[PDB]
Curated annotation (Swiss-Prot), chain A:
Residues 40-52 have a biased composition (Basic residues). This is Small ribosomal subunit protein eS24. It is found in: Cytoplasm. One of its GO terms (molecular function) is methyltransferase activity. One of its GO terms (cellular component) is cytoplasm. The chain holds residues 69 to 136 of 136 of the full protein.
Length: 68, 150, 52, 261, 180
RNA sequence: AAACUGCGAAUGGCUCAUUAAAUCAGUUAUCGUUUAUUUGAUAGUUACAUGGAUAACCGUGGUAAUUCUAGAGCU
RNA sequence: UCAUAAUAACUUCUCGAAUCGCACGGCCUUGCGCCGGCGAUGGUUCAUUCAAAUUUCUGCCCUAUCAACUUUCGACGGCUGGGUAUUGGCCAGCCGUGGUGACAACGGGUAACGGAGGGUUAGGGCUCGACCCCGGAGAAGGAGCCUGAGAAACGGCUACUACA
C-alpha cells in the first residue's frame, strides 16, 4: 500500500526534550554524540581482574621491584 | 469412670493457678474465683456433664477442668477398643465410588481419641469427637457425648 | 607533627593565660560588632520593606 | 524454600490485572504494604497499562521520583505500591482524582471523581478492643488504627474516615436493609440490599442479598462491604453493578451502536 | 639472618643483616614480648635493651603470640585473630602458624629499642620521620594544646599548605574537619 | 580514587539420583509458633555535647608459589 | 486462665536519641540570650503485609512362588521434667501391655519426582507426562558448623573416601 503509520512525541521545550527523552534516539537524530566504550567481555575481564589487588589499585607497579 | 483414689502417684496433682489454702474463707458463685474446682463450657451445643462439677479427678487433657480447647472438625463413630488407660479406638466406615464400574465399595479407617473420666464408655458405642491440639504421637481428638444405647 | 615545628608547638602550647584572656576579649569584640552589623543589615531589609 | 520469594512469573499474575501473555516473562511483583497481595492494584500497572500516561518502565519509575502522584493525600515513591479498594489517588498537575472500585465484570476501572467528594474514605472494621494503658482502639481493612472510638461501634461495621485528621465522623451499622457491595468471590461487582442473614455456629456464615431487579444471591460475610443504608454515600460507576446477562448485553450493545450511528 | 630494628620515639626503622651465630646466641629460647640485652650483639649497642616483637620463618609463615612450640602447627583461625583477615562474616579458614618460641629455624627477626644507649646508631637514631597528620577531635585538640573550657578552639588547629599542579596561582589551606 | 560502616549475596538458573501414605492434590486448623522489610499508631525515672582503639596512609621485610601476611609510626 | 488493670518482689538484663541535610524566621530584661519549620537515619509494644514450620479429612502402578507384622537399644498409652520459636514418645526417669491386618497389613519390583495436563474417540475407556505453570529434593559420595530475621547454603567453611 501507500500509507504508513507511526508514533509521534511533541515537547514543550527543547530542554524538556533532552531531560526526559532517551539518549539512543538523540543519537538517531544527531542531536547528541555516541558514547565510546570497550566491549562487554573486556570490561567484565577488567572488573574481576582488579578483585585481586588490595588498596590503590589504580597504580600497582610498586610490587614489580620486589624481585630485584 | 471408676477411680479408687485421686492422689496415687509420685507427684502431687492439682489444677494450676487455683489457690487452695487461704486464711480467710469467702463464698462466691464463680467456679475458679473462690478457690474451689474450676470448669468451663466447650460450646457447639455441648452440655457439661453433671459428674464433672462434683467429681474429684484431676486431668489436664479433659476439655472440662482442663487446659485444652476444641476447634476444628467434629466426627462420629463406633468404639472398637477401650481396654487401655484413658484412651479409646473408634472405627469409621464409608463408601468409595469407582467411576469406571458405576458402583461403590466399603472402606474403613481407624482413629484414636482421648476419653475423659467423666464418661463411661463400653464396646460397640456411638461417640462424637472433636479436633484438638496434638496430645500424643497419634491422638488428636476428644470425646464429647455418648449416644444412648438401643 | 609535620605541620608545626617543635618551636611552634612549644610556644603555641605555652602561650600565657593572660594573653589568652586578651585574645578571647579581642575575638569576641569583632563578632559583637558583626552581629550589630547583622541588625544593621536587617534594618537594610527593613528599609527595602518600607520602599516596597 | 530457604527464605521468602522476590520474583513473580508472568502467567501467574492475578487475572484482573489484564496482562498480555507475550512481551516479556515477568510481572511487577507488588511490594508488601497495606493491601492483600492477591487482590491489589500496583501503581505501575495502573499508571502505565490503564491511563497510558507512561510508555514503559523507565519513565514509569521516573514519575514517582518527581513526587507527582499521591494516594490518600500522602506521596508514594515506590513503583510497586499495593493500592486497593476505596483508596483515593490524586494527580494535581493534571487536576483529577480517582477511586479504585470493581466494575461489574470483576476488575478495576478508571472512575473520575469530584474534588470536594474526593477528600474522604470509608472502610470496614476488622477488630476492636482496648490496647496498652486501657485505651480502646479499632483497626479497619486498610490498616488504619484509631484510638478512642464510639463505644457502640462493633466489628463488621463500616466507618467514614476524613483522610486529613483521621477522626470518626460517622458510621453505618451492619444489619438487614443496608446497601452493600461484594468484595470477594465469584460475585465481583454486585451491589445489593441485605435481605436477611443466617448464621452457623462454628464459623463461615452466609448472607443473602437481593438486587434492585429482584435478583437473588448469597455470599460469605468476609466478602460483604456495606456502603450505605439508602442513597449510597459514594458515587457508583456506570452500570451500578447489575450484572445483565449476555442476551441483553448483546441487545443493548447493538441498540447503542444503532442509536449512535 | 635479617633483623628489623625500630625506634618508636624517633619514628625511625632500619634493617640489618647478621651472619655470625654466636652474636645471635643470646636470643635463643626467648619468648615473644620479652626483654633482652643487646650487649653481645656489638660494641655500638652497649647500654641498649630490646623487646622481642616478632619474626618470620624461612618458608614465610608468621609468628603467633600465645602458642608454645618450636615447630609450626595448624589452627582454625576465626575472626578477630592476628594473622587472619576473613573475607565473609563468620567464615573460618584453617591456616598454619609457627609458635612463639624463638629458634634457629626462623629467617628474620623484628625487634624495637626500649631504652636509649650511650652510643648512636649511624642510620637509625639520627633521623626523625614527621607524623603525617594531627588530631581531629575537638576534645583531643583541647587536651593536646592544653586549652580551657572556653578558648575558641576553632582558631587553634594545624594547617598544612597545599598547592595545585601548575596553575601559577598562590597555594591555599586545608583543614581537618573537627568532629563532635 | 582508596578504605571503614550499612544492605544484598538464603532470590534467580539447572537437573530428576533417591522417594510407594512418602512427595502431591482439593479441603481445614494454629485458643500450639517465628517473622527482615513495608504501612499505621504508640513510651515525662560535664548536657553548649563523654572515653580509648582501628582502616585508609607514610616507610621497612620474609616465601619458587595464592584474593597468603608480619612488626614500626598517625587519624 | 482472653484483651487489659492492680499488689508483694526479682534481674551479670533491655529500651526510653551525645546521629545527619535543607530553609534564615520571630521576641527584649540586647545576651555571641530565648523560641520556631520541613526531611533523612534509628527506636519499645500492638496491628498489617510477604511468608515460613507443623497440622484435620479423602485420593496413588504390578506382585500371595510376600500372611501375619511392630517392641535388642520406643514398639501403643499414662505421669514428672529436659530440649525446641511452640505442641508432640522429640528426649531422660517411673508405671501399664499395647498398636496394624483378608475392606490385603508387612516385604519385594518399578526401565517411578507428583500435579495442572498431552495422544487417541459415538458413548464407556486405553496410554503417556524428564521438559516453559505450581509443589518437593540435590549440587562427586556421607556427616558437622559460623554469620545472619532467614542456610544444616556448597559460584560459604571443616573432616573422611574416590578422582585430580
Ligand atoms: Mg529456588
Ligand atoms: Mg473461628
Ligand atoms: Mg529417571
Ligand atoms: Mg515502623
Ligand atoms: Mg509434656
Ligand atoms: Mg485385634
Ligand atoms: Mg528414578
Ligand atoms: Mg513433570
Ligand atoms: Mg539445599
Ligand atoms: Mg552441604
Ligand atoms: Mg559451580
Ligand atoms: Mg546458588
Amino acid at each position: 500500500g501507500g500509507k504508513t503509520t507511526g508514533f509521534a512525541l511533541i515537547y514543550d521545550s527543547p530542554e524538556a526534550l533532552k531531560k526526559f527523552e532517551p539518549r539512543y534516539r538523540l543519537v538517531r537524530a544527531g542531536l547528541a554524540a555516541k558514547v565510546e566504550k570497550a566491549s562487554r567481555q573486556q570490561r567484565k575481564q577488567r572488573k574481576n581482574r582488579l578483585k585481586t589487588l588490595r588498596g590503590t589499585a589504580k597504580v600497582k607497579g610498586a610490587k614489580a621491584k620486589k624481585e630485584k | 469412670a471408676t477411680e479408687l483414689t485421686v492422689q496415687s502417684e509420685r507427684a502431687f496433682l492439682k489444677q494450676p493457678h487455683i489457690f487452695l489454702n487461704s486464711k480467710v474463707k469467702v463464698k462466691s458463685t464463680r467456679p475458679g474465683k473462690g478457690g474451689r474446682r474450676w470448669y468451663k463450657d466447650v460450646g457447639l451445643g455441648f452440655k457439661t456433664p453433671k459428674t464433672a462439677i462434683e467429681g474429684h479427678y484431676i486431668d489436664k487433657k479433659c476439655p472440662f477442668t482442663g487446659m485444652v480447647s476444641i476447634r476444628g472438625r467434629i466426627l462420629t463413630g463406633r468404639v472398637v477398643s477401650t481396654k487401655m488407660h484413658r484412651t479409646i479406638i473408634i472405627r469409621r466406615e464409608y463408601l468409595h465410588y469407582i467411576p469406571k464400574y458405576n458402583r461403590y465399595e466399603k472402606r474403613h479407617k481407624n482413629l484414636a481419641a482421648h476419653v475423659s473420666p467423666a464418661f463411661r464408655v463400653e464396646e460397640g458405642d456411638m461417640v462424637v469427637v472433636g479436633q484438638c491440639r496434638p496430645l500424643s504421637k497419634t491422638v488428636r481428638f476428644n470425646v464429647l457425648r455418648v449416644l444412648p444405647r438401643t | 607533627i609535620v605541620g608545626a615545628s617543635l618551636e611552634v608547638i612549644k610556644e603555641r602550647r605555652s602561650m600565657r593565660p593572660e594573653a589568652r584572656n586578651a585574645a578571647r576579649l579581642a575575638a569576641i569584640k569583632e563578632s559583637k560588632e558583626k552581629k550589630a552589623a547583622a541588625q544593621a543589615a536587617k534594618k537594610a531589609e527593613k528599609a527595602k520593606n518600607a520602599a516596597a | 524454600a530457604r527464605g521468602p520469594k522476590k520474583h513473580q512469573k508472568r502467567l501467574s499474575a492475578p487475572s484482573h490485572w489484564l496482562l498480555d501473555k507475550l512481551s516479556g516473562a515477568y510481572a511487577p511483583r507488588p511490594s508488601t504494604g497495606p493491601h492483600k497481595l492477591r487482590d491489589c492494584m500496583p501503581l505501575i500497572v495502573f499508571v502505565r497499562n490503564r491511563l497510558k500516561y507512561a510508555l514503559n518502565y523507565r519513565e514509569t519509575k521516573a514519575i514517582m521520583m518527581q513526587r507527582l502522584v499521591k494516594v490518600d493525600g500522602k506521596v508514594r515513591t515506590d513503583i510497586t505500591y499495593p493500592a486497593g479498594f476505596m483508596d483515593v489517588i490524586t494527580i494535581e498537575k493534571t487536576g483529577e482524582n480517582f477511586r479504585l472500585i470493581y466494575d461489574t465484570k470483576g476488575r478495576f476501572t478508571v472512575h473520575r471523581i469530584t474534588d470536594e467528594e474526593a477528600k474522604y474514605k470509608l472502610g470496614k472494621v476488622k477488630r476492636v478492643q482496648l490496647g496498652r494503658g486501657g485505651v480502646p482502639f479499632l483497626v479497619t481493612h486498610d490498616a488504619r488504627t484509631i484510638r478512642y472510638p464510639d463505644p457502640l461501634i462493633k466489628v463488621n461495621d463500616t466507618v467514614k474516615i476524613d483522610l486529613e485528621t483521621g477522626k470518626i465522623t460517622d458510621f453505618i451499622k451492619f444489619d438487614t436493609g443496608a446497601l452493600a457491595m461484594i468484595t470477594g468471590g465469584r460475585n465481583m461487582g454486585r451491589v445489593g440490599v441485605i435481605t436477611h442473614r443466617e448464621r452457623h455456629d462454628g464459623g463461615f456464615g452466609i448472607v443473602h442479598l437481593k438486587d434492585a431487579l429482584d435478583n437473588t444471591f448469597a455470599t460469605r460475610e468476609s466478602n460483604v462491604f456495606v456502603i450505605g443504608s439508602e442513597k449510597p454515600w459514594i458515587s457508583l460507576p456506570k452500570g451500578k453493578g447489575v450484572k445483565l446477562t449476555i442476551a441483553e448485553e448483546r441487545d443493548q450493545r447493538r441498540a447503542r451502536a444503532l442509536a449512535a450511528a | 639472618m635479617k633483623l628489623n630494628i625500630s625506634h618508636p620515639a624517633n619514628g625511625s626503622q632500619k634493617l640489618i643483616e647478621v651472619e655470625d651465630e654466636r652474636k645471635l646466641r643470646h636470643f635463643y629460647d626467648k619468648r615473644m614480648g620479652a626483654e633482652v640485652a643487646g650487649d653481645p650483639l656489638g660494641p655500638e649497642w652497649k647500654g641498649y635493651i630490646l623487646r622481642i616483637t616478632g619474626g618470620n620463618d624461612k618458608q614465610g609463615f608468621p609468628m603467633k603470640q600465645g602458642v608454645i612450640a618450636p615447630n609450626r602447627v595448624r589452627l582454625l583461625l576465626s575472626e578477630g585473630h592476628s594473622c587472619y583477615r576473613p573475607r565473609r562474616d563468620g567464615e573460618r579458614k584453617r591456616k598454619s602458624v609457627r609458635g612463639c618460641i624463638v629458634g634457629p629455624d626462623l629467617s628474620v627477626l623484628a625487634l624495637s629499642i626500649v631504652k636509649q644507649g650511650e652510643q648512636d646508631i649511624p642510620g637509625l637514631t639520627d633521623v626523625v620521620h614527621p607524623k603525617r597528620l594531627g588530631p581531629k577531635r575537638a576534645t583531643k585538640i583541647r587536651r593536646f594544646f592544653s586549652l580551657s573550657k572556653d578558648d575558641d578552639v576553632r582558631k587553634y588547629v594545624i594547617r598544612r599548605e597545599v598547592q595545585p599542579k601548575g596553575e601559577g596561582k598562590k597555594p591555599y589551606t586545608k583543614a581537618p574537619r573537627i568532629q563532635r
